[PDB]
Structures are given as C-alpha cells and as structure tokens.
Paper text:
AaRSs catalyze the attachment of the correct amino acid to its cognate tRNA which then is used in protein synthesis on ribosomes. Phylogenetically phenylalanyl-tRNA synthetase (PheRS), belongs to the class II aaRSs, and it is a dimer of heterodimers (αβ)2, containing two α- (PheS) and two β- (PheT) subunits. Structural studies of PheRS have shown that the α subunit binds L-Phe and ATP and is responsible for esterification catalysis. At the same time, the β subunit is involved in the recognition of the cognate tRNA molecule and editing of mis-charged tRNA.
Numbering used by the authors:
A (entry chain D): 99 to 147
B (entry chain A): 99 to 268, 273 to 341
C (entry chain B): -2 to 831
D (entry chain E): 498 to 831
Amino acid sequence: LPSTRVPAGARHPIIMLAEHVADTFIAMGWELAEGPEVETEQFNFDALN
Amino acid sequence: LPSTRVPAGARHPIIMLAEHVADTFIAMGWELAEGPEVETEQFNFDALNFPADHPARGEQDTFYIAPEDSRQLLRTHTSPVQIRTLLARELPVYIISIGRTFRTDELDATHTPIFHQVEGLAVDRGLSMAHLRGTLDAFARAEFGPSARTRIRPHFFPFTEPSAEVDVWFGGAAWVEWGGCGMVHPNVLRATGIDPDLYSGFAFGMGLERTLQFRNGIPDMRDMVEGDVRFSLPFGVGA
Amino acid sequence: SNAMRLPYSWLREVVAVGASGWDVTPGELEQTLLRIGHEVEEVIPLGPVDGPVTVGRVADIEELTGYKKPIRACAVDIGDRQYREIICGATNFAVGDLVVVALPGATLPGGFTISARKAYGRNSDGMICSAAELNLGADHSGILVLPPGAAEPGADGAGVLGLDDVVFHLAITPDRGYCMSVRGLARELACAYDLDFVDPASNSRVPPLPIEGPAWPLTVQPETGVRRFALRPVIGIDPAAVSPWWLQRRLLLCGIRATCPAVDVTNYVMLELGHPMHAHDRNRISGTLGVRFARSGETAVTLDGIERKLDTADVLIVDDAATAAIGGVMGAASTEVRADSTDVLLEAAIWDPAAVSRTQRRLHLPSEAARRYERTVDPAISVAALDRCARLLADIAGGEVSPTLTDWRGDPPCDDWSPPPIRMGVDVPDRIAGVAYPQGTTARRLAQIGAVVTHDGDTLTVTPPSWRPDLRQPADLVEEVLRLEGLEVIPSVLPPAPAGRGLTAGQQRRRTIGRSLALSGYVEILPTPFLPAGVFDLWGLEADDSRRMTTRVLNPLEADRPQLATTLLPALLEALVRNVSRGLVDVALFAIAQVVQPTEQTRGVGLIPVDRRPTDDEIAMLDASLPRQPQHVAAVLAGLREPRGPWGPGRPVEAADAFEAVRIIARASRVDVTLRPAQYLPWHPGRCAQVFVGESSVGHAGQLHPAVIERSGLPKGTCAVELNLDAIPCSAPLPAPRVSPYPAVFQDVSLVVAADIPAQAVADAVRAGAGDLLEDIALFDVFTGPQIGEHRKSLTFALRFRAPDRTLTEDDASAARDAAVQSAAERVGAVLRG
Amino acid sequence: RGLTAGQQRRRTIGRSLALSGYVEILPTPFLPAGVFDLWGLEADDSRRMTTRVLNPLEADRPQLATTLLPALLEALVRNVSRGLVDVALFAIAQVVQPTEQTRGVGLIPVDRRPTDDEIAMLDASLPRQPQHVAAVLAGLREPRGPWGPGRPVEAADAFEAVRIIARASRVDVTLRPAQYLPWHPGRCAQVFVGESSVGHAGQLHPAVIERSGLPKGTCAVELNLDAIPCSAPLPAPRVSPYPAVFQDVSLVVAADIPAQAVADAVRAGAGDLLEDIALFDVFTGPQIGEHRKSLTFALRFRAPDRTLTEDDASAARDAAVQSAAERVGAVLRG
RNA sequence: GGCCAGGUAGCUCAGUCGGUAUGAGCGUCCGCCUGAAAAGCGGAAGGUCGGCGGUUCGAUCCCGCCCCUGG
Ligand SMILES: Nc1nc2ccccc2[nH]1
Ligand SMILES: [Mg+2]
Ligand SMILES: [Mg+2]
Ligand SMILES: [Mg+2]
Ligand SMILES: [Mg+2]
Ligand SMILES: [Mg+2]
C-alpha cells in the first residue's frame, strides 16, 4: 500500500549538475567563488582586455 | 503554532565528525578508502612490522577470533588499511580511512572498547616529516579552528620510524594528546613491494570519540556510544 | 608492564658524576623527558612536612588492654633529656626501633596539624607516623621503622627520609628497554643536555673483581637462547645484617620492598644498571648447575611458594636435585635466600627475550626481571653488574667476595656484543626531517647515544652500542638524531597531493541515506558489533538459520557476548530498549554499518614473509579466509510515529512506517524497489515485506513478531527494517524528460480484487495495459463493505492521460483505460466495479 | 578549504526542502509586467526601487527582480494551468536591490591594478544583491490516498517551510504576526533570527491572488539568507540516568497571545529541570472567557544528579506558571 | 589474580543470614476531577532479588561453579 504521505519533491537538475561539478573540483583542491550578476563594465569588459 | 508534524531526527555526531574530517582531506586531494573490521593477523601485525613474541605485539591486547591461534582478529587499528591500499593502489598514495577499531578497554567516561579512528597514509617521492607536520596542522585547524596549535613529540609504533604523538592546544588551555603519527617504516614499504630508496611516507591515526570529547567538551563518553536520543538530538539534523 | 619509577635525587646523582652541579626543576625535567620520547605518567613530590618531625627511638612500650584494638603507650627518645609519651595503634615495632615522630605543631601531608590529644586515658604528645602519612610510601598497616644506624634520635625527619625528593613515574616504550634503569635514563639526559656521561656500569665505576678460577660447575644448552651466564660467590654474610636506609629508601621509591641484604642488593643493582640479578643460597645447590629447556609436564615451585606448570619452550636453571629458577622470570624456592643464608651464589644471566616473553605471559608472571629481559638487557654489563652486586653485598652484610667467577659467553665465546654496523648518508636525517641541520649534527648525536661512527666521504658507518639492539636500520638512526635535536624544529609544509576523485558512489550514497532518514524523523546510533546473549533464541530462529553462523571472539569483555553481528537489528533493538526504559517511548532509530557473515569455519592463513610483496594469489587467499562484511542499513520504530499536538492525538507506529523507511532509502539510493509479502523472523509473518531491487532480494521490513516482542522486552507494535546496501546496485540515471504542452485527461477506475492481491500488483497491471498515454496513477481508496464480496476489496485509482503531440478525446483515454482494465482482469483477476 | 559555510548551507536548505515535498525551479531575474501593481504595493515600497534594463527581451518586462516571489508565482501559474494543481516550488538565488539611482563609475586604466579604494568605489555603485530563499504553495499540501482525502495548503505550511530552512541553517527563528503585502495581514508572519528580521511567510492576500490569477489560498515564503548569520554550535549534552517526571499545565491567555510566547515563559520559569515541553491542546469555548484560549503543554522534568519527588517538579511548574503570568498574563486553568 | 564488597521493579536505590521485598522515589494503570489533561486525594499492577546446579518439605537469604562491576 502507498505509505508516502509527503508529496514528490525534487531539486533542479542544473543545480544538481552544478553541485556535481563543484564537488569534482573541490576534490582536486579547487574552491568555489562568488560574483554579482549586476556587474560594472570595468569588471565585465574593461579589465578583461 | 506548532507545524512540524515530523518527529525530531538527527545523525550521530561521530558520523558528522567523520564526514567533516573526510571533507577536509578530500578538499586537499586525498581520497577515502575502506577496510574490513575482521582482519587477518598478517595485515594487522605482521605487515605492520610488529615483532613476533615481542611486547610490541604482546603488551597490546587484541580481540582474537576463535579458535585459538587462528591468525584472525578484530583489527586493533585502521592501520591494516595502509597495507591493503599500498598493495592494491598505484603510487603516489594519499588516503584516509574512517572505520571502527577494537581495543580491550573498559567503557567509562573517557575510554571505550569500540571506537572510530581516522587513519591517514601518504606515500610519494620525497615525503618528509615536514609534510606530516603540515598535514597535521591543517587537520587540527579544520577541527579546532584557525587558532589551533599542535606539537609533536617522539614516541614508538612498530609500523613507523621515527614515530611521534600529536598534542593539540586550541585544562582550559594546555597540551592534550590527540593521536599518533610518524614516517612509514621501510619494512612496511618492503612488505608491500615499494622501494624505500625511491618512496617515503607518513601515517597518522586519531580517535573520533576522543576528538569530539574535547572539541565539544563532552563529559561522559558512555553517552557517545550508548545510543540515547538525548545525546544525538541536540546536534540537529546534520545536513 | 612498562612502568619505570625512580626518585629524582638518584637520577640527578648519576647524571652529576659526569656533570657536577647538574640540577633542574621537576617541571623542566618532565618537559625534557617528554621532548625526547619518555612518557611521564606522574610526577609525585614527597611529603611535604612542616614543624617538628624528627627521628625517635622507642625506649618503652606499655600495652593498654581492654579496647577494640591493641593500643600501645610508648616512651620515645627524641634526642633530648625528656622522653615523649606517644600512643600508637600499630604493632609492627619493638623497643629499640627507630621511628619517625610528628610532634604537636607539625603538619603532615594533607594539611593535618598534629596536637596533643587525651586519648585512651593517656597523654599523647604527638604520633608515630607511617609511610603513607608522611607521603613517603603506600604502607599504612603499620608505622615506619628505620633500619638500625639510619640516624640518631633527634635527627630531622624530612632530611633523613629525604622528603625533598620527587618520584617520576615513567612509561617506557618497548623499543627502549635500556631506559628501565637509572643508567639508561641518566644517559638519555646527558644526551639531551649535551653533558659528559660517566657510565655507572663502566669498569671505572665498577672495578672488576679478581678472576682466579671457576665459581661453580655449569652446563649450558645453547639452544635455549642464553647469551651469557655468570656466577660469583659471596661467603660468610651476616644473617643479622640489614640493608642501610639509603638503600631501602631508594628501593621503596622505585616500588620495591626491602627484605634482606642479599635480595635488596640484587634489586638495587637491577634498578641502577638495568641488569636483573638473583641471589642463590649456595649451600642449597646440589651438584652441577644446568641451563636447559623444561621437559613435558615438568613443574617448579617459584620462591613465592606456587607450583608452576612448565612448557618445553621454557628455559630453566636446574641442579642435580631440583629446579633453581625459571630462566629470567623467577627463582625457585629450592635455592632462595632465607634468614639463615650465609653463603650466596649471585647469578648474572642474559636470556632470550622471546623465550622470556612467552614464558612470563603464559605463567602470568610479569616480574621486574621478566619485563626487562623481554625488552633485551645489555649483555656487555653482566660481569660488571655481578661484581657490583658482590662488592655491595659483602660490604653491607659483612661477607667476603670470593675471587672465583664463572662466565659462560656462548659457544664459541663471544667477545663483542655490538650489533652489526649500519651505513647511512650523512644528510639522510636532514632529508627525512625536512630540516637542514648544522654540519656534524648526525655524527655528534649518534656518538652521543653510544655508537661508533666512521666517515667514508659522504657515507657514515655506524655501529650501535650493545645496549641499543633497537638500532638496526638507517630509519632507527634517523629517529635518534631527530628526537635529540627536537621535533619542534621541523617546519610545517603541505604535501604535494595530486588531484583526487572525491567520494565513491557508495560513500555518497551512505551520506544521502543518513541525511534522508534523519530528516524523516530517525535518530542515528552507533551499533555495537557484538551480539547480545542468546538474542537469536529470543527471535526463535531455527538452528540452521544463516544468521546464527557467526564469528566468535576468544577473549571478549563480556563472556556471554563473544559472537559478532550478522545483522544490525539486535544492536538497534538494545538501543531502543534503553531509550524507552528511560522515558523516551516514541523513538525511531537507524544505523548504517557493516555486519560479519562467514561462509566457512574460521580458517587461518600462515605467516607470509614480510621481506617481499605478497603475490596476488596470496592477497586473494587472505581475503577468502575472511568472513563477508557487507554494508547494512537498518531501523527500528516504537511508540508514536507522529507526535501529538494541536492537530490531534498523534499516530502509533505501524508496519507501513517501516515500509516507508524502505522507500526513503530507495529514493535516497535512486533505485526502485518492490515489496512482496514474506515470512522471515523476527518479523510478523502477516505484516512483513521482502524488499527487491529488480530480481535481487535486499532485505525485509514490517512489524516484529509479537512473541519476539514479548520475549525480548520490547514495546508492543515495534517495527523494524533491514537492507543490505551492498546488494543494491549503484545507479546513476540520466533522465531526459519531454514536457508535453497539451492538456491531460482525468479518469478514475474502481477495480474489485481478492483481498490477498497487492495494490501495487493492480497498479502495475493498469500501467501495463494503459500504455504510453498514462502519465500518472495514484491509489486513493480501498473499500471493503459487504457490498463488495467477502475477502474482496475495491481499489480506486486516479488516472491522468496525456499525449505528447495532440489533444486527446474522452474516447481516446477510455480506450487506454479499458485496455488497462482488461490487463488487470488478466493479471490479478480484477473486476470492474458494478 | 572546500565549501564555505554559506555554500554548505545552501545545499542543506535545498536538500531539506526537496525531501519535504518542494520542487526546485530556476527563477528568472526579469520581473513581470507591473507585478508590484498586481500586489498593490505602495509607490514608496522598497521593492519598487528596482534596476531597469535598457534593451529587454520584452519591452513590458525591463525591471530586475527585487524578490524571488514573482518568478516562483509565475512558475506556479504554469504548473496549475497545465493540470498540476497541487504544487510546492522553491528557489535559492540572489536578488537585486539598488539603494540609489543607477550610478556609473569612470574608466580605470587597465595597465595597472586598481587600488583598494577604487575597488570599494566600484562596489558601492552596485546593488546589494543578497542570497534569498523563497517558496510558493498551492492546492493539496498532503496528497489524498487510502489514509484519507488529503489536506489543502494553509499558512502553517509556509511557516513549516521557515522552520525547515531554519533547521537546515542550524538557527532558531521566531515568528511574529505582521502586515506585509502581498501576504494576508491576518495570515502573515515576519521571521526573526535573534533581533534581525530575515523575511516573511504565510498565506497571500486574496485580492492579490484574484488579480494575479493565482490559485485560491496560495501561500508563500521568502527569507534573506545573508541576514541569517552562519552558526556552528558545539553542543555538549549530558544524558541523565535518573527518571523523569511527566506533568501537564493548562494556561488561559488572551487570543492574541502567541503559543510560542507562553512556551518561552514556561521554559524561562521552569528552570534547568525542564527537559522537554510540547503543546498538545488549544481549547476555546464558553468555559473560557470570550476572546481567550486555553493551552495545555506536556512537560518533562529531569534532574542530572537525583530522582525527583513530585513536589520538586510541581515547584518548577509553579515557577513556570508565575513566569507565564508575568510575561503573557497567563492564568492557571481552574 | 587475592579475600572481600556490589548485581534487587521500567529508572535510581534501600532492605532482608529459609515460608510477605507489608520496599522507597519517580515510571505504568484505575477512580474522583477536566471539554480533554496534569496536579491533588484515593487505589491497583508489575521483581521469577545476576545465571546454572546443590542442600531443604520449602532458597533473594545457606553451599559450589560461572557471568557482569568497584577496591
Ligand atoms: N592508529 C594509529 N595509526 C597510526 C599511524 C602512524 C603512527 C601511529 C598510529 N596509531
Ligand atoms: Mg626507534
Ligand atoms: Mg536496575
Ligand atoms: Mg491519572
Ligand atoms: Mg496515583
Ligand atoms: Mg506494590
């Protein structure tokens, strides 16, 4: 008989893929950074040649 | 108004600590190995340079598997995983192992017969005591904060030479013994088909129950292993 | 044991011979001993005492009668013209004995101030102190009696007793047997402090006694492993003599009791030089002394009066009449020294360490001599220790050293006891330490510890001394250099670890399962690997149940629990009983751990030579001799599964909660499971499911059998689940869903089946017949009214049909529904509800 | 050093919400056409101060997202309009909150490294952009089945999402009644970590629901994860081997008194003997005064060094009753 | 290993050297009480007194062996 009173949940695959990519690089010694989406043109174009 | 119709759950703090320790070493490129709790005497003693009929093997009490003189036992440490790794894996080797270990100690507020240990083993070209000390300091910083200071002092273990013990300084603040370490004995490398003139290595071992005892100030170690929910629940769900 | 007790004054004295004026505080000494590798278990200062604590002599004793214990009124001479009257309850002294008196105004260790009390109808002007009250020794049965000549009445007690001293309790590692003596520890301190060392066993400190002939006829069987056997007699010792106080005090502070000068001298030289010594009554030796293996069934009475069953691998000392000693463990009662012994034959022997270790362990005799021999004793100092004994005993007991000496040194005689030389690069300690040491550091440190060092360009040839049999490989020499320079100078450098692969799939799976169960209301516990006593009998298992084929432990901490866990449930149920029996009655526990399931009787594998790599066949052979150790996840539930609250009274645990635990683990493992009714103890045969992943069975779940619950003292309705994680294949699916933008069709179907038909079987049949158009199916009603036949039930499923490329008509969905109904009719005997 | 504390928290929050029946979505950062006008927000609402886009994909959606709710409520409409009417979605993403008009920074020479003062000048010219977690719910919260007909979503399900996030963050939250559009003013809770406001939760305003085409009874949550401090507590529990004492206390309070406030007052007065406390009864009726309610809490007392007498426990209970009288005006049920 | 000393209700313990442990505190159950509880008052249930044997007409108690703790 059905026993799960909790509805079906799921994390997004893209988040799951990002987690798997992040874990792959942490295992190689790398780290995870941060970045704003609203960016200045100094950091998005000017400082990148 | 209360809305949590689910009972409070929790993972055990020792499992959470092992998971934090495993994450700490994986973040440095290390991997996590496995090992059976019932181990042959060859891998628990003979391959680890334990001398026969010597107090190095005699004064250490062991849970032996029936019948008598069966060359089978409950492993006294996670050190046999060093033998299994060096026999199965290719060089270089940078591994940690977290598993149950068995000693014949009476269960009280600071001792437990059945506890969990963290074994570390690194084998590579040009590994020195400085690399062991660097690994130990990073380990202690991850578990005891950035202000954690360690000290190593000489000791003895059959499978290491030189051998040492690790103390930690995070009473209120003094030197407390954390675990044992040392360079992998060249006999252990020869017993696994490794040239001691080409490869060197170090190893270490810390008890998880002992680590959690002074990292959190827990009084009774009997509460760590008896399974009362009053001990686990305050630690939260844990991931 | 590995304990070494010694007072600082003695240790300081031996160091100070070569380093006059050397003196350090106890705190610094503890740190220096620790920094070179000597575990300091305790630092015990003697006393302290304050006020009038003086030596006295008991000049009279009056026996006060009529009490609960014999009480003595004593007149004590304390060195002045007025004898002090003191009441004492001890009976271990006589008139004329020297004692230690604490007078009124004195303060004993513990803050106890002494005053004159009116006790037993008499005047007590102080007290006669025991070693425990003075914090000198552990004895408290009687009072302390100093040997005659120790001091005169009126001497300061603290000075005579040496209460300014400090006792160091050391734990010596088994690789440093040479440190079980003042000689070794003093040499270590000379190394640590860069001091000139005068060896207390050298010929300048123990000048050799004459050698004019053999001391006793001796035959040695070299197969016993004896390396040296020396004998020298001391004749005409005074049976009335007692050891001086300085000797008895140093023995006491080292944990040894004084008895007679012959035994005291052997014990004292043992502590000073590290060479065990024994005194035989020579007048009780009959014929030639023989060193040989014991014979089968041979016994021997040790000098403690206990008969010892010997073994063919035990080494004995025998004469023509009896056994004289168990070689290197204990002497026999036949040649022991007694109160009337006048002629003594001292024995200085070096025994095989392995033979002594085997014998003393089998006989449960870890004597002071045994633990030193099993850790190797310097064979070069045997005659030195012998001569040191003979001269000290002759001096103390008024005897005369005999100029005879027997000295068996092997066949052929061995003249040099030095280990083989070792070749090592001059910078090898630098490379292993990661430290550039100053030039000459390695050579200086290795010569410090007593080795001979010769230089051949860049290669050192190092011959370790005879008392360091642990120095066999260059790594051993490296440790000597590093520990003496100090491990604190080694820098902290992170190793060059390569890019790793992270956690295995199995390691990530255990994390996900533990996280999901904890978030679902379960508490994790660590299961003990030892099964409780007769738990399978409580479960009512058959005698041939595979769970009973366990692995037993020879020496468990609980004799009733030797076997290892073939299932995680007994440990979880024990933790459940602990919780419920302490007021936590609504509990759900889980555990992820391994079990031990052997497939054959315990078969051991012989010793493989550890000088080479074991072949792949030998590696696979050692693995097959070990029991199988699969990873299991298990859980137990009792009490309320849903707590009470403002919503209602809560819900008691039922079997469906255990089935839900299976589904949580399944979703955490990214696999699909099927549940089928099963019979499997200790579960309830009507409320037990067998869990399958594909066609492979992975465990069981449900409510436990009520008879098992009663017999085990468990809460009623206790449920349990156990799965073998190793039997569940690791899966990494890659779904590629295509969301249909067209509307769906909602239809419900009511099917009547026999009560025994599982609902999942009706659902699978509906899916099989409906086809690809079926997007979702959910059971939402089970009805069992008499309108339905007896032993029958109505099941209503909600169906959702959707096409990927078109909008369906009601007839389109009804066609798929009718094919699903026909499929249920054929597979589970379903009838459309009328 | 691996994952930062915050990065670990976002994983635990995502794992816990999914295991609790929530489906994650990727929220779009482009606000719908006048979404705040649908919410009825005031013209001076801090959420209306958005960053605009010069060339948007759609000329009627050029505003950036100040809150994650418009994107989640949009994804909720897609699911409900396509037959999936019982939904619960969440999203863990950052938002955009400018504190002034869009200001520009002059060109800094690329041939050199900008000084730390030039870096700080470039950061201040950007919106704050904190990491948020939000969720929306509609339809059946508990699906129907053989157990029964299921439970529709209610405001308490949004508050439970807060407690799910709070447990994943290893922090304690307090909920207080509050008015904050687009939430229903009588079904809205402001969430607090210590003294810092971290977001809101509860049922949505019925006018907002009708004007947005949302399902009736839609509930929503939104928390500011950057306002929730990181915590790594080190508990040191000591399990008492002595038996406990079970007692219940019935307290009458005004209807507006939150049940958690009474629980906190009972705990503060009961002292260290109180091992557990749970509310299991909320009773109204003429036996109790008008606009009042009776709350019964189950209490568990235990000493660490002794067995208690019933008088020991009752003494701790009376002290708890006194503390509730002084803090929330509670009256012992007579 | 030594002679002792502990093992007693669900928890923590007291107490008995042969026919009731009139066991305590808390835990469990019932009644009064309450909308439902708790307290309060009034009552009940539950120990095969560590296990296996022996002695005895009968053993928690005496004897032997054993298991589990502290000195
Ligand atoms: N368990 C353990 N492991 C060790 C590894 C090196 C030195 C000492 C050790 N004790
Ligand atoms: Mg060494
Ligand atoms: Mg008890
Ligand atoms: Mg009642
Ligand atoms: Mg009552
Ligand atoms: Mg009774």
